[PDB]
Design a protein around this ligand. Structure first.
Ligand SMILES: N#Cc1cc(Cl)cc(Oc2cc(OCc3n[nH]c4ncccc34)ccc2Cl)c1
Lengths: 549, 405
């Protein structure tokens, strides 16, 4: 195949480094013979060139057969060269989402033939791509070659090749603004809203443009027929979707089985609504073997269960219409899990997705929702270069309240309430000012750093009192422990005074779920209660009964 | 013109920074700019042979419909700090902060006359994203001095000194400080007189190419930590009063509360009033009297990063403190405001920076009470300065908020 009449990219080794010089390991008679067959051809094509013994450099070569087959293939261990090559620009920095594709009349797939081989290697650099076919044993000086094109396994091949390929289309692009070219690896996705024939036409005018450049594509009939089975998806004309998901019916599950499982699941969730993975995902905690069998839990089998139902039948996603707004709707799925779906027209989803994140130790639904919103938002900028309008399971009055009082700066773009339960709410709120005719627990807690032993009690302004000894805690723990007590012994209207900013901080944030059990109980209290004020003071300072507790 | 050679701070090389997803509106906006600059020959497409990257945003700039392109040279600036600061440094006028009026002028355009060191250009590479990775980013690099790169003024210095010479000669009591792309111009003149000297100055600039914003530094009076005044002092209010006071020691020298704290003895209801002793009424005094007057002992160390920390109060109110060493505040203040949390936080950030440049000649490291991700998606919607300070995201401690409220 042709070798591109196109400009070369100036490759350079990393600084204070010279080309590789790896001794060639003695090869068998067959291995050498083969390599010799292969090489000559390659050089016959000009993909390679014979060199002298003056050239200091070397990279090792090898030749492996083929399973089933009696065809040899030359391997060129390019490590040291790579370890020594400059670093290049990152090839493609993400990969288009089917959901982001604007629908076209006709889309054709064209795969370049011998991509790397069809393109020039900076003359000044070939010197390093030097390799040596050993002779029959020690004796005899090996045969020497070097590349004229982009070797496979070398650092800049993918980059340079793409660079090139980008430049080769720029022209055809210019005279073809209404034609979309999707450059992916050594593929070419060509879409147009043309009338079949002129499409078949434009494609060839392309193939020609490509051939005039060294680029051998395939003719009609020789080219793929949609559904296009790209990157895990199915690419029909007016829809797309993940590629065929088969969940394994099986007696017993091992670490590897579940992992593979969670994977197809997560993948499947781009477009299948409400696919859950928490229960399953949990079995994976503290993981033992890879083959170690894991007895699904009741919750896990139900997750699996529900998930089977989801996939039984099939969902497809539609394409993008830049002439319409993006609507994104989120819902609370459960135990810290969320799910959303983007659609441009009521219920004809572009894509779906899920959000779980435990951002923090203790957080709440109002925070999680916004964590989701931000997450969703980015996704959109990336996929569409625009943010959606949100439909959220939360009251505007609830939002504004929280946002308002909350310490952190916060912000959601355009949204609207939507009565899709559960609705997001604040589960309790703290008094702005000191409840009157309400007890006054001056709570306290401390732990001995050495004995890891700790006490935790309070002293009310009504003579009531209490202490407690905790086994292996910390101040942190003792301090939450104190406030729990004070809440526990006090009925619908406490006033609590702590010297712990920690607990303060925690509760002030209105948690409604927490990595901690103690913090979890402290929650039950707060909710059940009726009015709660809570203040902080400096300890070691003759503050109230602080000197007391 | 012969180009001045720029050496990357030894043992380390080019910035290889990731590029944010930009919005379709910003990408087109941006693409136009670059096609233009390209033709004018300030930037040229670059090849895969360049592994470097610098981010690029699109902004607007106070009172303007036209998009401006902003380049985030923060990393490069770090890597080039010897050159631009301890090699080609610009001195900062103490006087500037004492001037009755300081006007800010964009001078950024100046740079494109100048050629960037040919060996350097690769460092200035930047990409122009594509929606849904549809295509490869437009990769470019600099031929001339870039705007946003701290090395630019360092070079252009000499050249700007000539441009300014006569205006300086003729207006001996006007301060001209340049920071990045901006020019700081201060005078204790009458407003219109000041305004005029500026227009006059603008003209001078005009002959050399270079084509405002109004501050009054000297009236940047403190934000004294405020102890309340009141008749009827509850326990609660005192537990509060010591807290603030107590915390204003270990920052404020000669603070006192021994008598105040006295007031508080036994498990007393917070909702209960307690008459005051008129010696504790002194620490209210003595401290309140201190609280207003600046920290004794806190000086600025030119060899020490500045930190600006900001708190959300409520109702468009935000508080901030600049200090080099925690609790040792070089300056506090408050900033109060179609404005959302981010819009405001953004505006404060720029305000604090401007003062910061004006006072110390350097920008503080911001500690932001926001989520990185949120801060990252939005900040560019309200950003207007041609510079970008550094930031870290943080969770304000309950106390810090009121201790400063
Ligand atoms: N194989 C493959 C493949 C990979 C990618 Cl990333 C893009 C692609 O093409 C499109 C796919 C598009 O949306 C779907 C579509 N429009 N018209 C069609 N005709 C037949 C099958 C699918 C589509 C729109 C434009 C395009 Cl270019 C094809």
């Amino acid at each position: 195949s042709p070798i591109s009449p196109i400009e070369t990219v100036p490759v350079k080794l990393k600084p204070g480094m010279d080309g590789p010089k790896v001794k060639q390991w003695p090869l068998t008679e067959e291995k050498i013979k083969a390599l010799v067959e292969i090489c000559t051809e390659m050089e016959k094509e000009g993909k390679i060139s014979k060199i002298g013994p003056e050239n200091p450099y070397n990279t090792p070569v090898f030749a492996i057969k083929k399973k089933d087959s009696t065809k040899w293939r030359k391997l060129v261990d390019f490590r040291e060269l790579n370890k020594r090559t400059q670093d290049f620009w990152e090839v493609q920095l993400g990969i288009p989402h089917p959901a982001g594709l604007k629908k076209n009349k006709s889309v054709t797939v064209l795969d370049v033939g011998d991509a790397y081989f069809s393109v020039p290697l900076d003359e000044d650099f070939r010197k390093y791509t030097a390799f040596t076919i050993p002779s029959i044993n020690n004796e005899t000086p090996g045969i020497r070659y070097q590349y004229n094109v982009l070797p496979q396994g070398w650092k800049g091949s993918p980059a340079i090749f793409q660079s090139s390929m980008t430049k080769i289309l720029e022209p055809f692009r210019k005279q073809n603004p209404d034609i979309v070219i999707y450059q992916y690896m050594d593929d070419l996705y060509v879409g147009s809203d043309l009338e079949i024939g002129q499409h078949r036409t434009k494609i060839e005018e392309l193939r020609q443009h490509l051939l005039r450049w060294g680029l051998t594509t395939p003719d009609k009939k020789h080219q793929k027929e949609p559904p296009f089975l790209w990157m895990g998806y199915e690419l029909h004309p007016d829809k797309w979707t993940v590629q065929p998901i088969v969940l394994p019916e099986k007696d017993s599950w091992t670490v590897n089985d579940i992992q593979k499982l969670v994977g197809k699941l997560n993948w499947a969730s781009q477009i299948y609504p409400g696919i859950k993975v928490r229960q399953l995902c949990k079995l994976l905690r503290g993981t033992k073997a890879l083959t170690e069998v894991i007895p699904l839990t009741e919750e896990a089998e139900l997750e699996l269960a529900e998930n089977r139902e989801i996939l039984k039948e099939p969902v497809h996603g539609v394409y993008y219409d830049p002439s319409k707004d993006l609507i994104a709707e989120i819902q609370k799925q459960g135990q810290g899990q969320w799910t959303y779906q983007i659609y441009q027209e009521p219920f004809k989803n572009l894509k779906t997705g899920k959000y779980a994140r435990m951002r923090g130790a203790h957080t709440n639904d109002v925070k999680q929702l916004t964590e989701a919103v931000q997450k969703i938002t980015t996704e959109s900028i990336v996929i569409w270069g625009k943010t959606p309008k949100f439909k959220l399971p939360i009251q505007k009055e609830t939002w504004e309240t929280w946002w308002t009082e909350y310490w952190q700066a916060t912000w959601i773009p355009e949204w609207e309430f939507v009565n899709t339960p559960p609705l997001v709410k604040l589960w309790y709120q703290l008094e702005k000012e000191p409840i009157v005719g309400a007890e006054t627990f001056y709570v306290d807690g401390a732990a001995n750093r050495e004995t890891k032993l700790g006490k935790a009690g309070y002293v009310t302004n009504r003579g009531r009192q209490k202490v407690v000894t905790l086994t292996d805690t910390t101040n942190q723990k003792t301090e939450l422990q104190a406030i729990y007590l004070a809440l526990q012994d006090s009925g619908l209207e406490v006033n609590i005074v702590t010297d712990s900013q920690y607990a303060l901080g925690i509760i002030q944030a209105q948690p409604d779920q927490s990595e901690s059990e103690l913090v979890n109980q402290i929650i039950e209290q707060l909710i059940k209660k009726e009015k709660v004020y809570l203040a902080w003071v400096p300890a070691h300072k003759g503050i109230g009964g602080n000197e007391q507790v | 013109i012969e180009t001045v050679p720029v050496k990357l701070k030894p043992g380390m090389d080019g910035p290889k920074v990731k590029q944010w997803p930009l919005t379709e509106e910003k990408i087109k906006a941006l693409v136009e700019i670059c096609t233009e600059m390209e033709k004018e020959g300030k930037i040229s497409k670059i090849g895969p042979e360049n592994p470097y990257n610098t981010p690029v945003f699109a902004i607007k700039k106070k009172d303007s419909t036209k998009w401006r392109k902003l380049v985030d040279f923060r990393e490069l600036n770090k890597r080039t700090q010897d050159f631009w600061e301890v090699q080609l440094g610009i001195p900062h006028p103490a006087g500037l902060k004492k001037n009755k009026s300081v006007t800010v002028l964009d001078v950024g355009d100046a740079y494109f006359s100048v050629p960037l060191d040919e060996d350097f250009r690769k460092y200035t590479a930047f990409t122009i994203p594509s929606i849904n990775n549809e295509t490869p980013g437009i990769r470019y690099q600099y031929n001339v001095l870039p705007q946003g790169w701290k090395g630019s003024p360092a070079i252009f210095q000499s050249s700007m000194t000539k441009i300014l010479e006569p205006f300086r000669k003729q207006n001996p009591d006007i301060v001209i400080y340049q920071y990045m792309d901006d020019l700081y111009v201060g005078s204790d003149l009458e407003i219109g007189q000041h305004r005029t000297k500026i227009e006059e100055l603008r003209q001078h600039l005009l002959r050399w190419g270079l084509t405002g914003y109004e501050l009054h530094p000297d009236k940047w009076t403190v934000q004294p930590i405020v102890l309340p005044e009141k008749d009827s002092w509850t326990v609660n209010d005192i537990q509060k009063l010591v807290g603030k006071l107590n915390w204003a020691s270990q920052i404020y020298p000669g603070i006192k509360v021994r008598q105040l704290c006295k007031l508080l003895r036994g498990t007393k209801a917070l909702t209960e009033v307690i008459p005051l002793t008129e010696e504790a009424e002194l620490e209210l005094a003595e401290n309140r009297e201190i609280l207003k007057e600046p920290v004794h002992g806190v000086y600025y160390d030119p060899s020490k990063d500045l930190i600006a920390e900001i708190q959300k109060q409520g109702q468009g109110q935000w508080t901030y403190q600049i200090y080099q060493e925690p609790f040792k505040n070089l300056k506090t203040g408050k900033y109060a405001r179609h404005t959302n949390d981010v819009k405001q936080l953004t505006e404060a950030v720029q305000k604090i920076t401007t003062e910061s440049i004006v006072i110390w000649g350097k920008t503080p490291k911001f500690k932001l009470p926001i989520q990185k991700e949120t801060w990252e998606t939005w900040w560019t919607e309200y950003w207007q300065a041609t510079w970008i300070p550094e930031w870290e995201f943080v969770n304000t401690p309950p106390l810090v908020k009121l201790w400063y409220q």
